Design a protein around this ligand. Sequence first.
Ligand SMILES: Nc1nc2c(ncn2[C@@H]2O[C@H](COP(=O)(O)OP(=O)(O)O)[C@@H](O)[C@H]2O)c(=O)[nH]1
Ligand SMILES: Nc1nc2c(ncn2[C@@H]2O[C@H](COP(=O)(O)OP(=O)(O)O)[C@@H](O)[C@H]2O)c(=O)[nH]1
Ligand SMILES: [Mg+2]
Ligand SMILES: [Mg+2]
Lengths: 240, 241
Amino acid sequence: SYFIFVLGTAGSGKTTLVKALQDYLLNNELDTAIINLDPAVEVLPYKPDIDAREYVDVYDVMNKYELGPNSSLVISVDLLLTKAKELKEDLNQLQANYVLVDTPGQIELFAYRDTGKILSSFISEGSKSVSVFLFDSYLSKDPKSFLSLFLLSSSIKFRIDMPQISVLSKVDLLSSSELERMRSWIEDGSIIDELGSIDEYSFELVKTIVENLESFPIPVSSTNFSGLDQLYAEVQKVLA
Amino acid sequence: PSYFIFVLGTAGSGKTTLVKALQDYLLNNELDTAIINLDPAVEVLPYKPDIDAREYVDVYDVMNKYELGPNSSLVISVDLLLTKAKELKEDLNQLQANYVLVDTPGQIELFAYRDTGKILSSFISEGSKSVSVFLFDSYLSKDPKSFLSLFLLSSSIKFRIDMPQISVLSKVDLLSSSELERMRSWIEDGSIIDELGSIDEYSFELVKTIVENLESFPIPVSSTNFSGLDQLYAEVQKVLA
Ligand SMILES: Nc1nc2c(ncn2[C@@H]2O[C@H](COP(=O)(O)OP(=O)(O)O)[C@@H](O)[C@H]2O)c(=O)[nH]1
Ligand SMILES: Nc1nc2c(ncn2[C@@H]2O[C@H](COP(=O)(O)OP(=O)(O)O)[C@@H](O)[C@H]2O)c(=O)[nH]1
Ligand SMILES: [Mg+2]
Ligand SMILES: [Mg+2]
């Protein structure tokens, strides 16, 4: 069994990539299941084999405790730890070599809460796991926001202790010219010239990123169905 | 002379409680401070806000008007504050205070990594100096790897919210004196390198850059013990000068 964890900011394309990656993998004759760990997602574009909404009803939490949407979201994600026993039980009943794991919409509720570390380590126990972090192309158009995503993706890795592949998601929102500037920003280091006013600390952080980064984030577009061959190949290399 | 203090941090790291404690410290020193709450989904507030986002955007109205769930409604509700920005500054100018405490939404992601955050933060503090305060949750900081993840997160937020940022170690009453001293030596002396296990070269070079270039340890503050607020305000003043 192989576990692929899809991470990223809200609306960065996690859920859509899970459906698009599943279609690519099933088209290439690999049986993949999907676990949805978002107990508050309204509409899913795929058929999840395990649905967190079947374990924790965020609407039940709202009125049982008389809390608002924000508190209920935090409480609902935390309740997944109490339902982890059933989660791993339903894992063994699925027989697939690859398992895609869709995470809650807000990565903060997953990575920076103990539920994230425990659940991800508990369900991938005895299996190989890899995480995929989505760089929102819309956020990456600005060089400072682009660099903030690199620091964010590095932060998540320190919380979720598993290898992480970087993906530039929703890349169809970019022109060929926009990608070339973003590519040269990191591959050459020209983002230094277009960085505005920085403190020495943050400037030293950017220096470390550009000079020590091994590869650019994989440009993927779930709607154009592009980059999934590169993403799958990078997943394979990590899993070896 | 109006000063805006934006309080940031992970969910449950103590932003709202610190806003009350900071207001209490400033009022004890006879400094007229107002509070803006920008969280449209908070149930109970421990302070009395001069501007409340819940009076401009009703998150429950958004839920059934749009027929969406809590997650989507939260995102839309935070975004709707931009439609109410005209009214927002109108009620702000009615305040004459030297310090304006800004309480942000519970999830820092909904604020920092959404375009609403910078626009709101830049719009209401127009014509004034602003400083940001990022809360390091002490409970998360007990683990050396999670501690470092907070340093990378706080640095990421600074690249999104373009204003000076003061780092605070919040909820420090959850730590023993020994735990706090170990966390200080972890970063100030670099001994955290030894307590990192085996990590990739990229992450290791990032840790090195943090330890060797960090200017100061985060200010240990405890809102429940009402400690460290003298250090925070002094650092706020030094930045605002
Ligand atoms: N252009 C483009 N839009 C996308 C892509 N993937 C997702 N989206 C859109 O982005 C919005 C949010 O995506 P979603 O899958 O919900 O991201 P999530 O919240 O992280 O799970 C949806 O309305 C999608 O239509 C993509 O590859 N390209
Ligand atoms: N022990 C301790 N608990 C705190 C402190 N500040 C806040 N809390 C608790 O942390 C929880 C979340 O605090 P809150 O201010 O709402 O966090 P926020 O989401 O960032 O606004 C609350 O239950 C508080 O009681 C503190 O200084 N010490
Ligand atoms: Mg989703
Ligand atoms: Mg709060």
